[PDB]
Structure 1
Amino acid sequence: LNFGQVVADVLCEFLEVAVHLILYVREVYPVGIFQKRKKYNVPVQMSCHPELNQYIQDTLHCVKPLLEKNDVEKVVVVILDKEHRPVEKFVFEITQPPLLSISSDSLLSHVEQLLAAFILKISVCDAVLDHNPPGCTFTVLVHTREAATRNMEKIQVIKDFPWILADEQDVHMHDPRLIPLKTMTSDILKMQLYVEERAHK
């Protein structure tokens, strides 16, 4: 039983819901595209725009083999302004511990409840973040344990959906304030989510 693939499936499905919800809560796109759905027993807002949905799906589909092999340190949702400068970053840090004492007592059920706590926190995170002007677009960054240039073949899973090394401008924020949102530990996955916010005066 390949638990690396189980962890990758669970994380890709979760990250897809989280990306949709971040875009809604931080007003990256007009509210009119979103529809309330149920994920992790929790009411989430998901885009109904087909091209946006396909971009997000394709992005996470490509990340899945890197997750399966435990080659991902963090997945980051970068919100960008009209000049493609980072406004805000949602950083999902990930480690997959030794998969050895894995519980037989409804493991995935316990994991889904820990992941639900992330979705719920994102849904109210406007209450703990600053209220700067919203961005108008975004990207997803995949930080790997090994040099990124050597995961290029592994990540390019989808025809005509190429990946590239990010520019420092896509990544760097000046002395950002780090706002922790949620942390979780489990037998198969440890993860923490925090936000990089613009620095204050």
Structure 2
Amino acid sequence: SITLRGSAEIVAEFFSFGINSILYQRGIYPSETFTRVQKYGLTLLVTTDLELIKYLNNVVEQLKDWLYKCSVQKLVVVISNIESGEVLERWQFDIECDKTAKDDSAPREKSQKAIQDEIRSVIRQITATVTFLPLLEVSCSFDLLIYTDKDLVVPEKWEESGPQFITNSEEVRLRSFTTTIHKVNSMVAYKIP
């Protein structure tokens, strides 16, 4: 059994490792930037750069918050050529949320194993994605997007931003894990050569 207490966390945790494993599997940050660790029963890499750690701790944390409340539905990783500004790759996580859970008599029935396994297969897929994605050879920087309700108060630093879709694109839809309180559809979108 599992509760909003934690299902908020599980998904936040996912975004940490995912965003890391995206950044590493892409060439966003240097390969030696990251360290080899165990989670979900795979070996993923998380970053070492203090700047990037402090950064992600803030987002993983801020998401944990909003997930509890069901404010956030989209999280996007926008990979853009820092030389030009142009967008080259775009990882997009849709978050179907079950509002009627704050009000649940009993915790949902679903083993840790279950959920920690649906993910093992998502992350696993994102990894095998490496073949057909085009290679980023220009200096690229990333950026997060969070989609949320107008009916929410967001800390002062954030600010409204264009969607930044890819001029000429090709998407590929991926597996979707779910805690029964949060479903996360994941799909990548690359620039057609």
TM-score range, shorter chain: 0.7 to 0.9
Quote the residue 1:128 is aligned against. 132
Deviation at 1:21, TM superposition (A): 0.6
Aligned residues: 188
8 Å contact from structure 1 (residues 36, 46) kept in 2: yes
Quote the residue 2:33 is aligned against. 33
Quote the residue 1:165 is aligned against. 160
8 Å contact from structure 2 (residues 173, 187) kept in 1: yes
Quote the residue 2:46 is aligned against. 46
Q: Are 2:19 and 1:15 equivalent residues in the alignment?
A: no
- In the alignment, residue 9 of structure 2 is paired with which amino acid? D
Quote the residue 1:192 is aligned against. 185
Q: Are 2:99 and 1:104 equivalent residues in the alignment?
A: no
8 Å contact from structure 1 (residues 28, 134) kept in 2: no
- In the alignment, residue 6 of structure 1 is paired with which amino acid? G
3-state DSSP of counterpart to 2:186:
strand
Map Cα deviations across residues 85-104 of structure 1 (whole Å, 9 max, x no partner).
22111111111234458543
Once superposed, what is the RMSD of the aligned Cα atoms? 2.4
Map Cα deviations across residues 93-147 of structure 1 (whole Å, 9 max, x no partner).
11123445854352x3211111121221222221232334355211110112x23
3-state DSSP of counterpart to 1:127:
coil
Deviation at 1:30, TM superposition (A): 1.0
Residues 2 and 21 from structure 1, CA distance in 2 versus in 1: closer, same or farther, beyond 3 angstroms?
closer
Q: Are 2:136 and 1:140 equivalent residues in the alignment?
A: no
Identity %: 22
Question: For 1:38-117, what aligned pairs fall within 5 Å after superposition?
Answer: 38-82=38-82, 83-97=84-98, 98-99=100-101, 103-106=108-111, 108-117=112-121
Deviation at 1:77, TM superposition (A): 0.9
Name the TM-score, length of structure 2 as normaliser. 0.85
8 Å contact from structure 2 (residues 115, 178) kept in 1: no
Q: How far apart are the structure 2 equivalents of 1:135 and 1:165?
A: 25
- In the alignment, residue 95 of structure 1 is paired with which amino acid? E
Bigger fraction of residues in helix: 1
3-state DSSP of counterpart to 1:113:
helix
Query: Unaligned regions of 5+ residues in structure 2, if any?
Result: none
